[PDB]
Amino acid sequence: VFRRFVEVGRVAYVSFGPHAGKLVAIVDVIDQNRALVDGPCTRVRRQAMPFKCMQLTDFILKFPHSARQKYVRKAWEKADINTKWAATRWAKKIEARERKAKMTDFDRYKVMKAKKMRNRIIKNEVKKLQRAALLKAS
């Protein structure tokens, strides 16, 4: 019941490979399993890239099926894709997963302390909510 489609000018996040973590707007599909791809703004060269690697986004900027780099660049910068990406939940939870990984052993401790407490202030509030739902039932 499909939603994201390999189109000309669909933007693709590259799961893995050389250019992992980069966006890229498909110019054109060469083959059953291989697309000719571009990432003008994103620091990715006009190059063929297989589908295997490129999981694909909800965006689809609009240029012609065989563009000349300038024009897909223009399309990109118009739609402000790079902003829109970065305000997506997806790209935020990439950054999240980046920031836990960066965590210094000091920060780790800090966090640990924080959550230790932040969980306690919830767990009591949950207890209360449970106690109050029992009173309503009675």
Partner RNA sequence: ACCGAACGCCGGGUUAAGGCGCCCGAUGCCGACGCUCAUCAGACCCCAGAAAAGGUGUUGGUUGAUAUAGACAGCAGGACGGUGGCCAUGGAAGUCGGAAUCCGCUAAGGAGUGUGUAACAACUCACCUGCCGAAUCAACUAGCCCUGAAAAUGGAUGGCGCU
Partner RNA sequence: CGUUCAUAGCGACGUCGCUUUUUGAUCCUUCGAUGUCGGCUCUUCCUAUCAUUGUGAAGCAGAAUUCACCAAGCGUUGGAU
Partner RNA sequence: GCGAAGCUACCAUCUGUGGGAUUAUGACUGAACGCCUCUAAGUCAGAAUCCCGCCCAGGCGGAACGAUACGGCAGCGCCGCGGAGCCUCGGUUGGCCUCGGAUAGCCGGUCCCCCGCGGGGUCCGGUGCGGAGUGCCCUUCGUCCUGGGAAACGGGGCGCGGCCGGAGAGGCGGCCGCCCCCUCGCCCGUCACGCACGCCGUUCGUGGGGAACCUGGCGCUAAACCAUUCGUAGACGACCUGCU
Q: Which residues contact 81 (CB under 8 A, 6 or more apart)?
A: 11, 23, 25, 41, 59, 61
**Alpha carbon separation from 112 to 60, 77, 92, 96, 100 (Å, rounded):** 41, 41, 22, 16, 12
CA dist., res. 50 & res. 30, Å (int): 9
Q: Which residues contact 50 (CB under 8 A, 6 or more apart)?
A: 33, 34, 35
Tokens at residue 34, please? 């291989």
- Pick what 71 binds: RNA, another protein, none; C-beta below 5 to 8 Å, kind-dependent: none
Taking a C-beta distance cutoff of 8 angstroms, is the pair 62, 75 a contact?
yes
Site string for RNA, 60-99 (x = CB under 7 A): ----------------------------xxx--xx-xx--
- Pick what 129 binds: RNA, another protein, none; C-beta below 5 to 8 Å, kind-dependent: another protein
Smallest distance from another protein to CB 59, Å: 21
Site string for RNA, 105-124 (x = CB under 7 A): -------xxxxxx-xxx-xx
Segment 46 to 105, residues that bind another protein, using CB under 8 A: 92-93, 95-103
Smallest distance from RNA to CB 24, Å: 14
Smallest distance from another protein to CB 47, Å: 23
Residue indicated by tokens 């990432």:
39
Site residues, another protein (CB under 8 A):
1-2, 32, 92-93, 95-103, 107-108, 110-111, 114-115, 117-118, 121-122, 125-126, 128-130
